[PDB]
Amino acid sequence: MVISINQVRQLYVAKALKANTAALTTAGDIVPKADTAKTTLYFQSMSPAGIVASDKINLKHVLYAKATPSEALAHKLVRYSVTLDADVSATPVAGQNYILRLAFRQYIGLSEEDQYFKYGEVIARSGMTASDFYKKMAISLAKNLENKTESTPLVNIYLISAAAASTDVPVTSATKESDLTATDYNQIIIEETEQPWVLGMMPQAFIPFTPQFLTITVDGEDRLWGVATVVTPTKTVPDGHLIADLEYFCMGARGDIYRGMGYPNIIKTTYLVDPGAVYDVLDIHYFYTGSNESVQKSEKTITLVAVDDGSHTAMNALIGAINTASGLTIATL
Amino acid sequence: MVISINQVRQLYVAKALKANTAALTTAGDIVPKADTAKTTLYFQSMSPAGIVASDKINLKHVLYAKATPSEALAHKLVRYSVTLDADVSATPVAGQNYILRLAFRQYIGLSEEDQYFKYGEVIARSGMTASDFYKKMAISLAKNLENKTESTPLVNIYLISAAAASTDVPVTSATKESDLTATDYNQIIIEETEQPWVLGMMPQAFIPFTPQFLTITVDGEDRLWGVATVVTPTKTVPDGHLIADLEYFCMGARGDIYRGMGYPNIIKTTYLVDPGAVYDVLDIHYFYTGSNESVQKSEKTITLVAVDDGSHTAMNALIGAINTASGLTIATL
Amino acid sequence: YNTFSLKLLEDALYELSASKLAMDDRLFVIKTGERGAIQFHKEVLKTVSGWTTFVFVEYKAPNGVRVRLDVDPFYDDPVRNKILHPMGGVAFSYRYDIWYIGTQPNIFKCKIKGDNEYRGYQW
Amino acid sequence: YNTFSLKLLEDALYELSASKLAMDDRLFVIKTGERGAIQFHKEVLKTVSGWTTFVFVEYKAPNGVRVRLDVDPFY
Amino acid sequence: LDTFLNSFPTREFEDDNEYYWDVIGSSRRNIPLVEARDENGVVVAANAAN
């Protein structure tokens, strides 16, 4: 997760808050340290190799200092609801080929902005009702997008029966109409998916989409049958993978910048962020001004992560300590 | 029936099983011979010219030995059932030309894989019902494929009346609607045919097919009317012609390899397989390893045929003798 | 427009060249993407229409004025163009720019002498 | 696809050449057999379609991109 | 099929190791929006004025 820096960013993990430098025993233990006059602030953190101290912050040169709740960094998974509009026809018209399109803004493995489609075919006959249409359209979509052949779909397909109205019925490339035995299917939902993530190689990223409907002839008029409305998300993607990458990149500012390049001849860094946990972040932007003739500012920032347990307890205590030490007025989560 | 060989194949006919070498009187009489220590096994068979002995099998070098029931080598004759689907229309639509296609995978005289078609035309009018359609489509097929002009059809056409449901009503290039007086015809069956066979010139072979239906307009939509389902075969093609060819080819490994080439100046071999009988086969794969520095294996096989009479009596006794002599554990049919 | 019409585009060519033409200098240029180029070709290559094609392909509207499609690639740029057309592609591709061409230029980009040297290094 | 459509093939050409084109290097090649070449020609040589033919025959999709059928024998 | 496969060129390598190649794009990028906040930091709701 290579990022843009105001000349530097440093990350220290607040795995545990201790009162004194003597209590720093485990890796991740941290203590905010400031003098009694409150001229400078620094952090003493226990690395796997002894305690390390952060840069010293001249508390007159602090540009801003705010903390996040770990809900701001979460990515809701977008999901639409597809439905055939009662205006054109509340039920499929025989003989017409219904072709649904999923307009993706990137390819599966690339991040450049492009137009990328996936399709779903259904040909309607004299007796096919709405339920059977959604069924066959869903299976077509699955067999066409869940042709991954290595890893996982690009979007997930479900069906909702009018009886449930809330129970998403999954559909996969293996599903077949024999498995789907309901008769009150009323829509199709299409959620985004969590794509593969690698620590310092593949950044967390999503591929949005839009369900587009091609034209059918109903009364000699080419018309659009579908309704791609956006129902509210129900699933989320936390920041653990996002934060872990922040550490992976910001540990090359005080540690080894190479990371596997000369693979046999490397230095391997131990990372304390647990991808799988949810961290609430804190950040302090400051600068160094200098002496006569040296007024140019060297702006910097020190950010700190801490696991959230619902209530942002860990970070709330950490900032309470920092406000008690440096006298700042950082706000709690 | 030129075959692939693991350096050799030899065939001996077990027209009769005798207990001793002295009882070998008629051609085809055979006796399995093995010593008391069971080191080697060989067969003494009466040819038209005296008794001949097979190769000697070192019973330590036997790779496999299995026998077949003569039902494995039989070829069921494939037959579909053609019918117009009630989805498009349960009865022919007037004005539309129904054209049936028979997609053959080879030509009539060649074995190379190609696409080869035969057609059947019927043009439907206001009063034509299903029965009359099947009737006229069958006669068209017969007149179009039974244009052999030398030998025999490429497939056989029949009709089934709803009253019989099991009595195939044959249709030939000579048949005419006056001969077909029923009104409850409900399908058309199209079986494969036994093509010409010559002893060592024309191998037994078949030409599969698939009934394909062209498109008709029913409600302004081009549609397929037919249902080419595969009913179970009722006729079979035994191995007599298949085995006879095996002998014809495998008798050139101990006999004369030329067979009619220098036609006046030839040697003519007497063959004991009766094409028209059904044989159950046995086979013994073995090898010769050799001495110092000569570890390379010369793998071989000796196969034996015997007429089946329902129960595989002849072969069961032959193997019982071979197990009693060579101590092997060949399984009975 | 919410729905496409070859009439609107013929009325536009009329507006541009009704009496202003000269019968020998009526070179027109329609610029659009590929989805708009579709709508154009789908309706123009018909026979009930009045256009005829002249194989570099050029068209001749029923007005008798010479036309030239120049499907530009930026009309489909998915970066600057974000809104999606219900009929596919980005809506900026369903967009025609009809310009009268002839013989001094109507459009030119202004420049100042010595503007290519404003490169400074603060090091 | 279970049923053929010249729209799907036009959408495919769009995907391939929408902004990536250069108006002078958009040579495309569609490879298929003879039955697919049939479906193509049956629907492409119509007038309601947007394709025009350029006698070695080459086609020009309604997208303005130059096409070239190469019916291969192995299909 | 040989004609089809002669339509392509040949690259002559020295060994039989797995081969790889790099793929690069462009910086021109769309950036989605997380939310918008007013002058007092309140998040802009959908059913709100300008």
PDB file of all heavy atoms in Angstrom, chain B residues 101-132:
ATOM      1  N   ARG B 101     -32.149 -33.760 -40.821  1.00  0.00           N
ATOM      2  CA  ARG B 101     -30.775 -34.016 -41.227  1.00  0.00           C
ATOM      3  C   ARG B 101     -30.194 -35.136 -40.382  1.00  0.00           C
ATOM      4  O   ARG B 101     -30.441 -35.212 -39.176  1.00  0.00           O
ATOM      5  CB  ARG B 101     -29.915 -32.761 -41.092  1.00  0.00           C
ATOM      6  CG  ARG B 101     -28.425 -33.037 -41.079  1.00  0.00           C
ATOM      7  CD  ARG B 101     -27.617 -31.764 -41.194  1.00  0.00           C
ATOM      8  NE  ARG B 101     -28.144 -30.705 -40.342  1.00  0.00           N
ATOM      9  CZ  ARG B 101     -27.977 -29.407 -40.569  1.00  0.00           C
ATOM     10  NH1 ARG B 101     -27.282 -28.993 -41.617  1.00  0.00           N
ATOM     11  NH2 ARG B 101     -28.501 -28.520 -39.740  1.00  0.00           N
ATOM     12  N   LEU B 102     -29.413 -35.999 -41.023  1.00  0.00           N
ATOM     13  CA  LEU B 102     -28.746 -37.121 -40.371  1.00  0.00           C
ATOM     14  C   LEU B 102     -27.247 -36.877 -40.486  1.00  0.00           C
ATOM     15  O   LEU B 102     -26.660 -37.067 -41.555  1.00  0.00           O
ATOM     16  CB  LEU B 102     -29.149 -38.445 -41.006  1.00  0.00           C
ATOM     17  CG  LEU B 102     -30.646 -38.698 -41.126  1.00  0.00           C
ATOM     18  CD1 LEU B 102     -30.873 -40.090 -41.656  1.00  0.00           C
ATOM     19  CD2 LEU B 102     -31.343 -38.514 -39.790  1.00  0.00           C
ATOM     20  N   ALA B 103     -26.633 -36.454 -39.388  1.00  0.00           N
ATOM     21  CA  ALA B 103     -25.233 -36.044 -39.387  1.00  0.00           C
ATOM     22  C   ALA B 103     -24.362 -37.270 -39.154  1.00  0.00           C
ATOM     23  O   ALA B 103     -24.187 -37.718 -38.019  1.00  0.00           O
ATOM     24  CB  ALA B 103     -24.992 -34.976 -38.328  1.00  0.00           C
ATOM     25  N   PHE B 104     -23.804 -37.807 -40.234  1.00  0.00           N
ATOM     26  CA  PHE B 104     -22.906 -38.945 -40.156  1.00  0.00           C
ATOM     27  C   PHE B 104     -21.473 -38.468 -39.972  1.00  0.00           C
ATOM     28  O   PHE B 104     -21.063 -37.434 -40.507  1.00  0.00           O
ATOM     29  CB  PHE B 104     -23.007 -39.800 -41.419  1.00  0.00           C
ATOM     30  CG  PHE B 104     -24.356 -40.413 -41.629  1.00  0.00           C
ATOM     31  CD1 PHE B 104     -25.234 -39.882 -42.553  1.00  0.00           C
ATOM     32  CD2 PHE B 104     -24.746 -41.522 -40.906  1.00  0.00           C
ATOM     33  CE1 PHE B 104     -26.476 -40.445 -42.749  1.00  0.00           C
ATOM     34  CE2 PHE B 104     -25.985 -42.089 -41.099  1.00  0.00           C
ATOM     35  CZ  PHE B 104     -26.851 -41.550 -42.019  1.00  0.00           C
ATOM     36  N   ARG B 105     -20.709 -39.239 -39.202  1.00  0.00           N
ATOM     37  CA  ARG B 105     -19.338 -38.876 -38.882  1.00  0.00           C
ATOM     38  C   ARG B 105     -18.328 -39.422 -39.878  1.00  0.00           C
ATOM     39  O   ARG B 105     -17.170 -38.990 -39.866  1.00  0.00           O
ATOM     40  CB  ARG B 105     -18.987 -39.364 -37.476  1.00  0.00           C
ATOM     41  CG  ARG B 105     -20.031 -39.001 -36.443  1.00  0.00           C
ATOM     42  CD  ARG B 105     -19.557 -39.296 -35.037  1.00  0.00           C
ATOM     43  NE  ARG B 105     -20.177 -38.406 -34.056  1.00  0.00           N
ATOM     44  CZ  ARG B 105     -19.656 -37.254 -33.647  1.00  0.00           C
ATOM     45  NH1 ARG B 105     -18.495 -36.822 -34.124  1.00  0.00           N
ATOM     46  NH2 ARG B 105     -20.300 -36.521 -32.752  1.00  0.00           N
ATOM     47  N   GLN B 106     -18.729 -40.360 -40.730  1.00  0.00           N
ATOM     48  CA  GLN B 106     -17.900 -40.829 -41.831  1.00  0.00           C
ATOM     49  C   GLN B 106     -18.765 -40.976 -43.073  1.00  0.00           C
ATOM     50  O   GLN B 106     -19.996 -41.005 -43.002  1.00  0.00           O
ATOM     51  CB  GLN B 106     -17.221 -42.166 -41.508  1.00  0.00           C
ATOM     52  CG  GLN B 106     -16.290 -42.141 -40.308  1.00  0.00           C
ATOM     53  CD  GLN B 106     -16.904 -42.773 -39.070  1.00  0.00           C
ATOM     54  OE1 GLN B 106     -17.856 -43.543 -39.158  1.00  0.00           O
ATOM     55  NE2 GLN B 106     -16.352 -42.450 -37.908  1.00  0.00           N
ATOM     56  N   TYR B 107     -18.105 -41.066 -44.223  1.00  0.00           N
ATOM     57  CA  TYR B 107     -18.791 -41.435 -45.449  1.00  0.00           C
ATOM     58  C   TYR B 107     -19.135 -42.924 -45.419  1.00  0.00           C
ATOM     59  O   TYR B 107     -18.843 -43.639 -44.457  1.00  0.00           O
ATOM     60  CB  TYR B 107     -17.930 -41.094 -46.661  1.00  0.00           C
ATOM     61  CG  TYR B 107     -18.170 -39.715 -47.212  1.00  0.00           C
ATOM     62  CD1 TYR B 107     -17.848 -38.593 -46.473  1.00  0.00           C
ATOM     63  CD2 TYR B 107     -18.717 -39.533 -48.475  1.00  0.00           C
ATOM     64  CE1 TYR B 107     -18.060 -37.328 -46.965  1.00  0.00           C
ATOM     65  CE2 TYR B 107     -18.934 -38.271 -48.979  1.00  0.00           C
ATOM     66  CZ  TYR B 107     -18.604 -37.170 -48.221  1.00  0.00           C
ATOM     67  OH  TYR B 107     -18.818 -35.906 -48.721  1.00  0.00           O
ATOM     68  N   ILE B 108     -19.762 -43.403 -46.494  1.00  0.00           N
ATOM     69  CA  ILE B 108     -20.234 -44.782 -46.516  1.00  0.00           C
ATOM     70  C   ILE B 108     -19.078 -45.748 -46.730  1.00  0.00           C
ATOM     71  O   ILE B 108     -19.070 -46.853 -46.179  1.00  0.00           O
ATOM     72  CB  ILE B 108     -21.311 -44.966 -47.595  1.00  0.00           C
ATOM     73  CG1 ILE B 108     -22.366 -43.863 -47.493  1.00  0.00           C
ATOM     74  CG2 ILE B 108     -21.930 -46.354 -47.470  1.00  0.00           C
ATOM     75  CD1 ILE B 108     -22.204 -42.766 -48.518  1.00  0.00           C
ATOM     76  N   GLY B 109     -18.099 -45.358 -47.538  1.00  0.00           N
ATOM     77  CA  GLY B 109     -17.002 -46.239 -47.877  1.00  0.00           C
ATOM     78  C   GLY B 109     -15.682 -45.888 -47.229  1.00  0.00           C
ATOM     79  O   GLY B 109     -14.704 -46.621 -47.387  1.00  0.00           O
ATOM     80  N   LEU B 110     -15.635 -44.777 -46.505  1.00  0.00           N
ATOM     81  CA  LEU B 110     -14.409 -44.309 -45.884  1.00  0.00           C
ATOM     82  C   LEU B 110     -14.550 -44.303 -44.369  1.00  0.00           C
ATOM     83  O   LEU B 110     -15.655 -44.266 -43.822  1.00  0.00           O
ATOM     84  CB  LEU B 110     -14.036 -42.908 -46.376  1.00  0.00           C
ATOM     85  CG  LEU B 110     -14.190 -42.685 -47.880  1.00  0.00           C
ATOM     86  CD1 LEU B 110     -13.825 -41.271 -48.236  1.00  0.00           C
ATOM     87  CD2 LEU B 110     -13.328 -43.660 -48.656  1.00  0.00           C
ATOM     88  N   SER B 111     -13.398 -44.338 -43.706  1.00  0.00           N
ATOM     89  CA  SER B 111     -13.312 -44.352 -42.257  1.00  0.00           C
ATOM     90  C   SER B 111     -12.750 -43.063 -41.679  1.00  0.00           C
ATOM     91  O   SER B 111     -12.761 -42.903 -40.454  1.00  0.00           O
ATOM     92  CB  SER B 111     -12.437 -45.523 -41.790  1.00  0.00           C
ATOM     93  OG  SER B 111     -13.011 -46.768 -42.146  1.00  0.00           O
ATOM     94  N   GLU B 112     -12.258 -42.153 -42.514  1.00  0.00           N
ATOM     95  CA  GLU B 112     -11.773 -40.875 -42.021  1.00  0.00           C
ATOM     96  C   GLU B 112     -12.927 -40.059 -41.463  1.00  0.00           C
ATOM     97  O   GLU B 112     -14.053 -40.119 -41.964  1.00  0.00           O
ATOM     98  CB  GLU B 112     -11.074 -40.106 -43.143  1.00  0.00           C
ATOM     99  CG  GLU B 112     -10.370 -38.842 -42.686  1.00  0.00           C
ATOM    100  CD  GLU B 112      -9.187 -39.125 -41.782  1.00  0.00           C
ATOM    101  OE1 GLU B 112      -8.576 -40.205 -41.917  1.00  0.00           O
ATOM    102  OE2 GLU B 112      -8.869 -38.267 -40.933  1.00  0.00           O
ATOM    103  N   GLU B 113     -12.643 -39.294 -40.414  1.00  0.00           N
ATOM    104  CA  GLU B 113     -13.673 -38.507 -39.751  1.00  0.00           C
ATOM    105  C   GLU B 113     -14.053 -37.322 -40.626  1.00  0.00           C
ATOM    106  O   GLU B 113     -13.213 -36.465 -40.926  1.00  0.00           O
ATOM    107  CB  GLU B 113     -13.186 -38.036 -38.383  1.00  0.00           C
ATOM    108  CG  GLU B 113     -12.550 -39.125 -37.536  1.00  0.00           C
ATOM    109  CD  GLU B 113     -13.451 -40.331 -37.358  1.00  0.00           C
ATOM    110  OE1 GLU B 113     -14.663 -40.145 -37.124  1.00  0.00           O
ATOM    111  OE2 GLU B 113     -12.944 -41.470 -37.449  1.00  0.00           O
ATOM    112  N   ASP B 114     -15.319 -37.274 -41.033  1.00  0.00           N
ATOM    113  CA  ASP B 114     -15.848 -36.182 -41.830  1.00  0.00           C
ATOM    114  C   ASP B 114     -17.292 -35.948 -41.419  1.00  0.00           C
ATOM    115  O   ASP B 114     -17.875 -36.720 -40.656  1.00  0.00           O
ATOM    116  CB  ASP B 114     -15.761 -36.479 -43.330  1.00  0.00           C
ATOM    117  CG  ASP B 114     -14.339 -36.448 -43.853  1.00  0.00           C
ATOM    118  OD1 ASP B 114     -13.518 -35.684 -43.308  1.00  0.00           O
ATOM    119  OD2 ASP B 114     -14.043 -37.190 -44.814  1.00  0.00           O
ATOM    120  N   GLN B 115     -17.863 -34.867 -41.931  1.00  0.00           N
ATOM    121  CA  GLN B 115     -19.266 -34.551 -41.725  1.00  0.00           C
ATOM    122  C   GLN B 115     -20.030 -34.889 -42.998  1.00  0.00           C
ATOM    123  O   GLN B 115     -19.746 -34.332 -44.064  1.00  0.00           O
ATOM    124  CB  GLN B 115     -19.436 -33.084 -41.340  1.00  0.00           C
ATOM    125  CG  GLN B 115     -18.882 -32.772 -39.969  1.00  0.00           C
ATOM    126  CD  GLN B 115     -18.963 -31.307 -39.628  1.00  0.00           C
ATOM    127  OE1 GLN B 115     -19.384 -30.495 -40.444  1.00  0.00           O
ATOM    128  NE2 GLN B 115     -18.553 -30.957 -38.418  1.00  0.00           N
ATOM    129  N   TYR B 116     -20.992 -35.800 -42.882  1.00  0.00           N
ATOM    130  CA  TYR B 116     -21.704 -36.346 -44.027  1.00  0.00           C
ATOM    131  C   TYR B 116     -23.183 -36.384 -43.686  1.00  0.00           C
ATOM    132  O   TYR B 116     -23.568 -36.959 -42.665  1.00  0.00           O
ATOM    133  CB  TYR B 116     -21.184 -37.745 -44.370  1.00  0.00           C
ATOM    134  CG  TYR B 116     -21.902 -38.433 -45.505  1.00  0.00           C
ATOM    135  CD1 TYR B 116     -21.680 -38.059 -46.819  1.00  0.00           C
ATOM    136  CD2 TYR B 116     -22.784 -39.473 -45.261  1.00  0.00           C
ATOM    137  CE1 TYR B 116     -22.326 -38.688 -47.855  1.00  0.00           C
ATOM    138  CE2 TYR B 116     -23.434 -40.109 -46.292  1.00  0.00           C
ATOM    139  CZ  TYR B 116     -23.202 -39.712 -47.587  1.00  0.00           C
ATOM    140  OH  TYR B 116     -23.846 -40.343 -48.624  1.00  0.00           O
ATOM    141  N   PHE B 117     -24.005 -35.769 -44.530  1.00  0.00           N
ATOM    142  CA  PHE B 117     -25.408 -35.555 -44.225  1.00  0.00           C
ATOM    143  C   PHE B 117     -26.309 -36.313 -45.189  1.00  0.00           C
ATOM    144  O   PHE B 117     -25.924 -36.658 -46.309  1.00  0.00           O
ATOM    145  CB  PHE B 117     -25.765 -34.066 -44.277  1.00  0.00           C
ATOM    146  CG  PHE B 117     -24.944 -33.213 -43.356  1.00  0.00           C
ATOM    147  CD1 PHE B 117     -24.433 -32.003 -43.783  1.00  0.00           C
ATOM    148  CD2 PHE B 117     -24.691 -33.618 -42.063  1.00  0.00           C
ATOM    149  CE1 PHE B 117     -23.680 -31.220 -42.938  1.00  0.00           C
ATOM    150  CE2 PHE B 117     -23.939 -32.839 -41.215  1.00  0.00           C
ATOM    151  CZ  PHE B 117     -23.436 -31.639 -41.652  1.00  0.00           C
ATOM    152  N   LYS B 118     -27.525 -36.564 -44.714  1.00  0.00           N
ATOM    153  CA  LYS B 118     -28.622 -37.054 -45.529  1.00  0.00           C
ATOM    154  C   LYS B 118     -29.883 -36.393 -45.004  1.00  0.00           C
ATOM    155  O   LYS B 118     -30.013 -36.147 -43.801  1.00  0.00           O
ATOM    156  CB  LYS B 118     -28.743 -38.580 -45.484  1.00  0.00           C
ATOM    157  CG  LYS B 118     -27.664 -39.313 -46.260  1.00  0.00           C
ATOM    158  CD  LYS B 118     -27.848 -39.196 -47.767  1.00  0.00           C
ATOM    159  CE  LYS B 118     -26.548 -39.463 -48.493  1.00  0.00           C
ATOM    160  NZ  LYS B 118     -26.554 -38.997 -49.902  1.00  0.00           N
ATOM    161  N   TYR B 119     -30.808 -36.098 -45.910  1.00  0.00           N
ATOM    162  CA  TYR B 119     -31.890 -35.180 -45.611  1.00  0.00           C
ATOM    163  C   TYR B 119     -33.238 -35.844 -45.847  1.00  0.00           C
ATOM    164  O   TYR B 119     -33.346 -36.868 -46.523  1.00  0.00           O
ATOM    165  CB  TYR B 119     -31.779 -33.912 -46.460  1.00  0.00           C
ATOM    166  CG  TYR B 119     -30.637 -33.009 -46.056  1.00  0.00           C
ATOM    167  CD1 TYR B 119     -29.424 -33.048 -46.729  1.00  0.00           C
ATOM    168  CD2 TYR B 119     -30.769 -32.121 -45.004  1.00  0.00           C
ATOM    169  CE1 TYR B 119     -28.381 -32.227 -46.363  1.00  0.00           C
ATOM    170  CE2 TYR B 119     -29.729 -31.298 -44.632  1.00  0.00           C
ATOM    171  CZ  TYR B 119     -28.539 -31.353 -45.315  1.00  0.00           C
ATOM    172  OH  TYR B 119     -27.497 -30.535 -44.948  1.00  0.00           O
ATOM    173  N   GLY B 120     -34.268 -35.233 -45.268  1.00  0.00           N
ATOM    174  CA  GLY B 120     -35.634 -35.663 -45.458  1.00  0.00           C
ATOM    175  C   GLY B 120     -36.581 -34.482 -45.461  1.00  0.00           C
ATOM    176  O   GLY B 120     -36.641 -33.728 -44.486  1.00  0.00           O
ATOM    177  N   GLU B 121     -37.337 -34.315 -46.542  1.00  0.00           N
ATOM    178  CA  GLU B 121     -38.187 -33.152 -46.736  1.00  0.00           C
ATOM    179  C   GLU B 121     -39.647 -33.509 -46.511  1.00  0.00           C
ATOM    180  O   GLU B 121     -40.103 -34.593 -46.888  1.00  0.00           O
ATOM    181  CB  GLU B 121     -38.024 -32.580 -48.145  1.00  0.00           C
ATOM    182  CG  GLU B 121     -36.939 -31.531 -48.270  1.00  0.00           C
ATOM    183  CD  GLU B 121     -37.080 -30.697 -49.526  1.00  0.00           C
ATOM    184  OE1 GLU B 121     -37.969 -31.007 -50.347  1.00  0.00           O
ATOM    185  OE2 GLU B 121     -36.309 -29.729 -49.691  1.00  0.00           O
ATOM    186  N   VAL B 122     -40.370 -32.580 -45.897  1.00  0.00           N
ATOM    187  CA  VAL B 122     -41.818 -32.655 -45.739  1.00  0.00           C
ATOM    188  C   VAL B 122     -42.339 -31.231 -45.647  1.00  0.00           C
ATOM    189  O   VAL B 122     -41.797 -30.412 -44.898  1.00  0.00           O
ATOM    190  CB  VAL B 122     -42.236 -33.463 -44.497  1.00  0.00           C
ATOM    191  CG1 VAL B 122     -43.741 -33.462 -44.351  1.00  0.00           C
ATOM    192  CG2 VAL B 122     -41.726 -34.875 -44.592  1.00  0.00           C
ATOM    193  N   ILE B 123     -43.384 -30.933 -46.409  1.00  0.00           N
ATOM    194  CA  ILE B 123     -44.006 -29.618 -46.415  1.00  0.00           C
ATOM    195  C   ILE B 123     -45.423 -29.782 -45.894  1.00  0.00           C
ATOM    196  O   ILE B 123     -46.216 -30.547 -46.455  1.00  0.00           O
ATOM    197  CB  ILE B 123     -43.981 -28.982 -47.814  1.00  0.00           C
ATOM    198  CG1 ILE B 123     -44.400 -27.517 -47.737  1.00  0.00           C
ATOM    199  CG2 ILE B 123     -44.868 -29.756 -48.773  1.00  0.00           C
ATOM    200  CD1 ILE B 123     -44.010 -26.725 -48.950  1.00  0.00           C
ATOM    201  N   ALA B 124     -45.734 -29.076 -44.812  1.00  0.00           N
ATOM    202  CA  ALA B 124     -46.965 -29.302 -44.073  1.00  0.00           C
ATOM    203  C   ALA B 124     -48.078 -28.406 -44.589  1.00  0.00           C
ATOM    204  O   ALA B 124     -47.848 -27.248 -44.946  1.00  0.00           O
ATOM    205  CB  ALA B 124     -46.748 -29.054 -42.583  1.00  0.00           C
ATOM    206  N   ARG B 125     -49.284 -28.953 -44.612  1.00  0.00           N
ATOM    207  CA  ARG B 125     -50.472 -28.278 -45.102  1.00  0.00           C
ATOM    208  C   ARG B 125     -51.502 -28.194 -43.980  1.00  0.00           C
ATOM    209  O   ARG B 125     -51.239 -28.561 -42.833  1.00  0.00           O
ATOM    210  CB  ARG B 125     -51.029 -29.000 -46.334  1.00  0.00           C
ATOM    211  CG  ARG B 125     -50.027 -29.131 -47.476  1.00  0.00           C
ATOM    212  CD  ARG B 125     -49.356 -27.804 -47.799  1.00  0.00           C
ATOM    213  NE  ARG B 125     -48.579 -27.853 -49.033  1.00  0.00           N
ATOM    214  CZ  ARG B 125     -47.864 -26.835 -49.502  1.00  0.00           C
ATOM    215  NH1 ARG B 125     -47.823 -25.687 -48.840  1.00  0.00           N
ATOM    216  NH2 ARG B 125     -47.187 -26.964 -50.633  1.00  0.00           N
ATOM    217  N   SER B 126     -52.689 -27.701 -44.328  1.00  0.00           N
ATOM    218  CA  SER B 126     -53.664 -27.316 -43.312  1.00  0.00           C
ATOM    219  C   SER B 126     -54.160 -28.503 -42.498  1.00  0.00           C
ATOM    220  O   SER B 126     -54.477 -28.347 -41.314  1.00  0.00           O
ATOM    221  CB  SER B 126     -54.849 -26.618 -43.975  1.00  0.00           C
ATOM    222  OG  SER B 126     -55.689 -26.017 -43.008  1.00  0.00           O
ATOM    223  N   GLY B 127     -54.239 -29.684 -43.100  1.00  0.00           N
ATOM    224  CA  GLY B 127     -54.882 -30.808 -42.446  1.00  0.00           C
ATOM    225  C   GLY B 127     -53.929 -31.876 -41.954  1.00  0.00           C
ATOM    226  O   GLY B 127     -54.339 -32.786 -41.226  1.00  0.00           O
ATOM    227  N   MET B 128     -52.661 -31.779 -42.338  1.00  0.00           N
ATOM    228  CA  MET B 128     -51.697 -32.806 -41.979  1.00  0.00           C
ATOM    229  C   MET B 128     -51.538 -32.892 -40.469  1.00  0.00           C
ATOM    230  O   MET B 128     -51.309 -31.882 -39.796  1.00  0.00           O
ATOM    231  CB  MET B 128     -50.352 -32.514 -42.636  1.00  0.00           C
ATOM    232  CG  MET B 128     -50.320 -32.885 -44.105  1.00  0.00           C
ATOM    233  SD  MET B 128     -48.806 -32.384 -44.941  1.00  0.00           S
ATOM    234  CE  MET B 128     -47.577 -33.091 -43.855  1.00  0.00           C
ATOM    235  N   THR B 129     -51.665 -34.102 -39.942  1.00  0.00           N
ATOM    236  CA  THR B 129     -51.507 -34.368 -38.526  1.00  0.00           C
ATOM    237  C   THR B 129     -50.125 -34.967 -38.275  1.00  0.00           C
ATOM    238  O   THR B 129     -49.287 -35.060 -39.177  1.00  0.00           O
ATOM    239  CB  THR B 129     -52.628 -35.287 -38.036  1.00  0.00           C
ATOM    240  OG1 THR B 129     -52.536 -35.447 -36.614  1.00  0.00           O
ATOM    241  CG2 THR B 129     -52.542 -36.644 -38.704  1.00  0.00           C
ATOM    242  N   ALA B 130     -49.881 -35.383 -37.032  1.00  0.00           N
ATOM    243  CA  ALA B 130     -48.578 -35.930 -36.676  1.00  0.00           C
ATOM    244  C   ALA B 130     -48.297 -37.225 -37.430  1.00  0.00           C
ATOM    245  O   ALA B 130     -47.208 -37.407 -37.987  1.00  0.00           O
ATOM    246  CB  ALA B 130     -48.508 -36.160 -35.170  1.00  0.00           C
ATOM    247  N   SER B 131     -49.269 -38.137 -37.452  1.00  0.00           N
ATOM    248  CA  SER B 131     -49.076 -39.420 -38.119  1.00  0.00           C
ATOM    249  C   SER B 131     -48.651 -39.231 -39.570  1.00  0.00           C
ATOM    250  O   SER B 131     -47.641 -39.792 -40.012  1.00  0.00           O
ATOM    251  CB  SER B 131     -50.362 -40.240 -38.043  1.00  0.00           C
ATOM    252  OG  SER B 131     -50.255 -41.427 -38.807  1.00  0.00           O
ATOM    253  N   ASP B 132     -49.414 -38.444 -40.327  1.00  0.00           N
ATOM    254  CA  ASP B 132     -49.084 -38.230 -41.730  1.00  0.00           C
ATOM    255  C   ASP B 132     -47.704 -37.609 -41.890  1.00  0.00           C
ATOM    256  O   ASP B 132     -47.004 -37.895 -42.867  1.00  0.00           O
ATOM    257  CB  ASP B 132     -50.142 -37.348 -42.387  1.00  0.00           C
ATOM    258  CG  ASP B 132     -51.522 -37.968 -42.340  1.00  0.00           C
ATOM    259  OD1 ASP B 132     -51.616 -39.212 -42.377  1.00  0.00           O
ATOM    260  OD2 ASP B 132     -52.513 -37.212 -42.267  1.00  0.00           O
TER     261      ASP B 132
END
